[PDB]
PDB file of C-alpha atoms (C1' of nucleotides) in Angstrom:
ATOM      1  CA  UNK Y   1      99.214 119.444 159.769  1.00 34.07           C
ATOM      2  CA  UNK Y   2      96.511 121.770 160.309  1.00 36.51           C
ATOM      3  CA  UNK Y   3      93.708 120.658 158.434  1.00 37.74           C
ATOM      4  CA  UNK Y   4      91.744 118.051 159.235  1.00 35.38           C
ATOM      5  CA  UNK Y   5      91.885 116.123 156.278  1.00 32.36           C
ATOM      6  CA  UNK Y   6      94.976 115.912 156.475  1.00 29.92           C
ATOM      7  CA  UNK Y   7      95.059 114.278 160.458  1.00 29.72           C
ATOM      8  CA  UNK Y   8      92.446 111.889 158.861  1.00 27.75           C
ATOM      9  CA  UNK Y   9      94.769 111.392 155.913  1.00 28.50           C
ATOM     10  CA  UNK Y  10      91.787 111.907 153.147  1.00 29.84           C
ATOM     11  CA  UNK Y  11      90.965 114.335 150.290  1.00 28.78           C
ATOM     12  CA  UNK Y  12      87.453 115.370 151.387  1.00 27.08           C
ATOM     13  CA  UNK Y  13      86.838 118.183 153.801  1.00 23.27           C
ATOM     14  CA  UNK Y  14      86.659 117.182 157.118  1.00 21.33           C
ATOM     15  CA  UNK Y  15      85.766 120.434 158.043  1.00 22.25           C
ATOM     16  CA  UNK Y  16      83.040 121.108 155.837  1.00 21.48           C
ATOM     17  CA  UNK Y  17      80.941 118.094 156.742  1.00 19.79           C
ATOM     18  CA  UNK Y  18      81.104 118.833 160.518  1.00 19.74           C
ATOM     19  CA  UNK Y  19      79.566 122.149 159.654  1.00 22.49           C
ATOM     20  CA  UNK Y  20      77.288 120.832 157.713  1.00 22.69           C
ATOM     21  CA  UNK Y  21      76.306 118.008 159.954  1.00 22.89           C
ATOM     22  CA  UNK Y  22      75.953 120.861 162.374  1.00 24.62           C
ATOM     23  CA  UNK Y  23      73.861 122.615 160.689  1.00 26.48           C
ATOM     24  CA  UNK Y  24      72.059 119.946 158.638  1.00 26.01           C
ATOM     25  CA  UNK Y  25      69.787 119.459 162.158  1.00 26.35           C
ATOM     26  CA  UNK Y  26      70.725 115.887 162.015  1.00 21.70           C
ATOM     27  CA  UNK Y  27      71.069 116.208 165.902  1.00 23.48           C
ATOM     28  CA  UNK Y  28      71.944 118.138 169.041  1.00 22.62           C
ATOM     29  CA  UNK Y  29      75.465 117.556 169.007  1.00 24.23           C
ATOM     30  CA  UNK Y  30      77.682 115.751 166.721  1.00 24.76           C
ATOM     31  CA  UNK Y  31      80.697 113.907 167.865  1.00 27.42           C
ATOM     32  CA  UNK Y  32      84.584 114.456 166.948  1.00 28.76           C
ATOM     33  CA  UNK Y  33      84.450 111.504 164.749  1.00 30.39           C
ATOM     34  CA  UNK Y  34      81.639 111.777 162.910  1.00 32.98           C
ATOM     35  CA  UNK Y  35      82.465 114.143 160.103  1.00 32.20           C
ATOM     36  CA  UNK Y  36      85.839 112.300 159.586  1.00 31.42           C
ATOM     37  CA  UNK Y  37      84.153 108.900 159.396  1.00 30.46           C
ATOM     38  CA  UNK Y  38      81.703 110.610 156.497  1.00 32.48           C
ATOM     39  CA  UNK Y  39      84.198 112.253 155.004  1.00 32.25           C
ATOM     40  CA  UNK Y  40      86.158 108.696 154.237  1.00 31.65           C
ATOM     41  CA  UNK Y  41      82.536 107.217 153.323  1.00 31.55           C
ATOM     42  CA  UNK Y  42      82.071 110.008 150.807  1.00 32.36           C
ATOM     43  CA  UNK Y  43      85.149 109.766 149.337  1.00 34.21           C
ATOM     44  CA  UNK Y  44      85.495 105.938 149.090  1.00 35.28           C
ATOM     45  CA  UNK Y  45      82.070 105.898 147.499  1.00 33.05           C
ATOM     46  CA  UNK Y  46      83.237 108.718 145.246  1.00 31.01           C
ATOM     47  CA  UNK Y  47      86.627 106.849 144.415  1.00 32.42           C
ATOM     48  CA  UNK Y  48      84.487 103.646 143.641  1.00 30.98           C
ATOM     49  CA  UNK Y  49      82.395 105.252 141.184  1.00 32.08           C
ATOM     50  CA  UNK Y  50      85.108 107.636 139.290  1.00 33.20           C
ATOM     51  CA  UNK Y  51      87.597 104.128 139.048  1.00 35.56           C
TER      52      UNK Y  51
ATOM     53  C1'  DG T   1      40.396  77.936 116.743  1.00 32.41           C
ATOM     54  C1'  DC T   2      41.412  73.062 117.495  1.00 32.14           C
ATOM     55  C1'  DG T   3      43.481  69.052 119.754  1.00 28.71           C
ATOM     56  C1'  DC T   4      46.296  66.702 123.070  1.00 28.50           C
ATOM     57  C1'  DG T   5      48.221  65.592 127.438  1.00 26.14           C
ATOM     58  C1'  DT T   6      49.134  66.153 131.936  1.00 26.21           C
ATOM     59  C1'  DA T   7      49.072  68.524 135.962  1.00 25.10           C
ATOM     60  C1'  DC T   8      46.496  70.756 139.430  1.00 23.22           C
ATOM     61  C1'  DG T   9      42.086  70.457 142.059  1.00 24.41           C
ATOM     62  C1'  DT T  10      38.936  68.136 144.965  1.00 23.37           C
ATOM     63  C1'  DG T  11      38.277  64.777 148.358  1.00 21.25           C
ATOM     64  C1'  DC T  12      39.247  61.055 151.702  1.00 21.29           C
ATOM     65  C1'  DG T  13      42.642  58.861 154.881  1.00 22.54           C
ATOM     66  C1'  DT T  14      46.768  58.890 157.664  1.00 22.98           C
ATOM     67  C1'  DT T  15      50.441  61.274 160.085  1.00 20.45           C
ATOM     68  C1'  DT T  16      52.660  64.941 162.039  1.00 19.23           C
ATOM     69  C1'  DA T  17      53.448  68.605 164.862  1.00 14.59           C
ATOM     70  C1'  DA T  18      51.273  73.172 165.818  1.00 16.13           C
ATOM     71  C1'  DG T  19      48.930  74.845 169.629  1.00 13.71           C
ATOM     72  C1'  DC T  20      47.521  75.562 174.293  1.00 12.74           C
ATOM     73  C1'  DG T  21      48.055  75.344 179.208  1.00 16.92           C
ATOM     74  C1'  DG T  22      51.342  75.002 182.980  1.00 15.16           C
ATOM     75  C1'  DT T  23      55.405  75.647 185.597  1.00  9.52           C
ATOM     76  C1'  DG T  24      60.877  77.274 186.227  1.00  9.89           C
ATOM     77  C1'  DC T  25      64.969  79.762 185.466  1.00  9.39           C
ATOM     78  C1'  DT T  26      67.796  83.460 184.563  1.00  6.50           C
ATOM     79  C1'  DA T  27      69.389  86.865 181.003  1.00  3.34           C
ATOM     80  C1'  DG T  28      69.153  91.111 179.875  1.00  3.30           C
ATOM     81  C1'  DA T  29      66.558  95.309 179.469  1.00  2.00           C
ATOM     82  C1'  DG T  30      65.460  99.138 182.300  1.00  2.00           C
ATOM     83  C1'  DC T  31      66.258 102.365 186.020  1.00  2.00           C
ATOM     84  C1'  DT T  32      69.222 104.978 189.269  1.00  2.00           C
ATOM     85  C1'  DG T  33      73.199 107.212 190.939  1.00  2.00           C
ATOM     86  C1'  DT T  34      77.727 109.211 190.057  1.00  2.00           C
ATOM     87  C1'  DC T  35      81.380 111.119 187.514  1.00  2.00           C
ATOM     88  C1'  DT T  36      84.324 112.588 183.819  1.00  2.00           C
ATOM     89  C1'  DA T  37      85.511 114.135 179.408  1.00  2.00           C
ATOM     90  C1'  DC T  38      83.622 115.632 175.040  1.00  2.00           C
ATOM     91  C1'  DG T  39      81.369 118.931 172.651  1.00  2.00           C
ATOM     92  C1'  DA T  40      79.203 123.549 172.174  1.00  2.00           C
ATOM     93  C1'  DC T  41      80.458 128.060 172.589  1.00  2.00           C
ATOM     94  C1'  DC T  42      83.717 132.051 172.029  1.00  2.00           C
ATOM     95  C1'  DA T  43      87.640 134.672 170.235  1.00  2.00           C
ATOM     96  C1'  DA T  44      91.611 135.198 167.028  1.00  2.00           C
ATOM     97  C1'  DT T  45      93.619 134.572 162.612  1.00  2.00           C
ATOM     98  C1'  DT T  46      95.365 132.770 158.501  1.00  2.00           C
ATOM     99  C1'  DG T  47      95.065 129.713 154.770  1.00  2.00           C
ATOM    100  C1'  DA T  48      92.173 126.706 151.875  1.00  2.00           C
ATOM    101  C1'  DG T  49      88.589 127.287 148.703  1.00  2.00           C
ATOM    102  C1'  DC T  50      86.219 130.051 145.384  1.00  2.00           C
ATOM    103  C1'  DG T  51      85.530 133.526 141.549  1.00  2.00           C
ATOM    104  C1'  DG T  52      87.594 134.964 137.579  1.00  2.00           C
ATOM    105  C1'  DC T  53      90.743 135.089 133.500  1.00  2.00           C
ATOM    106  C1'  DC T  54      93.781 132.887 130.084  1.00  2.00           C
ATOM    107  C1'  DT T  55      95.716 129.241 127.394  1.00  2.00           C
ATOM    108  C1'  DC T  56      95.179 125.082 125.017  1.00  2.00           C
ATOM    109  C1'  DG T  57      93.854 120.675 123.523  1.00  2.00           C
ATOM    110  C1'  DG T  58      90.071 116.996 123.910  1.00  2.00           C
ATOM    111  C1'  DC T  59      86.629 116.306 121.343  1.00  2.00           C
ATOM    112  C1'  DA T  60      82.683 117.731 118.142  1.00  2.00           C
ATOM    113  C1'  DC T  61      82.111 118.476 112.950  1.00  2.00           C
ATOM    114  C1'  DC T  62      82.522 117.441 108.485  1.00  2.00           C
ATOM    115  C1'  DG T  63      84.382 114.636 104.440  1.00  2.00           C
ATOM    116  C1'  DG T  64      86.211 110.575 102.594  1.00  2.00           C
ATOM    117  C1'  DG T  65      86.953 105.576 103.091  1.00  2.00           C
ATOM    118  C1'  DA T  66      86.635 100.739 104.932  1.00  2.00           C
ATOM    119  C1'  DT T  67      83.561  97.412 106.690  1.00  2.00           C
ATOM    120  C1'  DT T  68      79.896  94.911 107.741  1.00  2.00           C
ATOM    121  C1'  DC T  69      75.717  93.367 106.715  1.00  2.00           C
ATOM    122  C1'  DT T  70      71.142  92.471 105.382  1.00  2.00           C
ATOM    123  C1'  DG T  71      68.276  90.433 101.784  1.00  2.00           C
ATOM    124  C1'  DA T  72      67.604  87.873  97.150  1.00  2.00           C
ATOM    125  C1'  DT T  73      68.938  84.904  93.396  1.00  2.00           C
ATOM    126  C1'  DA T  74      71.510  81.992  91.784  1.00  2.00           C
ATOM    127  C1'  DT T  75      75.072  78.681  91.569  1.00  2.00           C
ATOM    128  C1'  DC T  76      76.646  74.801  93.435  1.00  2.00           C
ATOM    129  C1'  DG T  77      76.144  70.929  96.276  1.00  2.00           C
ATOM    130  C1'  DC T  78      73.325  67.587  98.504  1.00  2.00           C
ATOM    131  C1'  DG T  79      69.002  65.069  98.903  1.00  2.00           C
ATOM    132  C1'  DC T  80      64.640  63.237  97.050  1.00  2.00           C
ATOM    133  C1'  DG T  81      61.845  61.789  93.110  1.00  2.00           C
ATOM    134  C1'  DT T  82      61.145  60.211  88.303  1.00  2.00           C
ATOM    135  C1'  DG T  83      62.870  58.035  84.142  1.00  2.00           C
ATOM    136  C1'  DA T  84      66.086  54.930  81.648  1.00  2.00           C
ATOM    137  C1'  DT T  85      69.175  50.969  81.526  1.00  2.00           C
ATOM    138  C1'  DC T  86      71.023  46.603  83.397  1.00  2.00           C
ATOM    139  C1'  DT T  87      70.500  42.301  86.152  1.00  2.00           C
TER     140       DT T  87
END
DNA sequence: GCGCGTACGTGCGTTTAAGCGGTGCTAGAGCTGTCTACGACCAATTGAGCGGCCTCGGCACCGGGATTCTGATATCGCGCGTGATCT
């Protein structure tokens, strides 16, 4: 699988919130990890409120 | 506004433990050196996401109907008071 997402198994972008972590200026660098363990924050917290 | 009653406040006595000074021990926070691997950066590219258009059906509107329901009165039942009868 090619997408991110998809390696993390989850439906929000991976990619999209290591850009914008990136350029959010949050920090000087911004680990591998990061945006994948937001992106299954996000979307559990999303999930919780749409059940 | 009035009246009650009781529950905090003020003060004195007793008790507790906070506080201060002192010494000891070592746990971990900080610093230093070294090294590696993780991330920024760059280039290529292709595919996921976005804008737009179309179709349609979920829901907003309107009309008619069912359903509470809120308030009063009144009826009926129950309780209290007064009158009549019996003991």
């Amino acid at each position: 699988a090619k997408t991110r997402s998809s390696r993390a198994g989850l439906q929000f972008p991976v990619g999209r919130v290591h850009r914008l972590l990136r350029k959010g200026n949050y920090a000087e660098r911004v680990g591998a990890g990061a945006p994948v363990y937001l992106a299954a924050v996000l979307e559990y917290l999303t999930a919780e409120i749409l059940e």
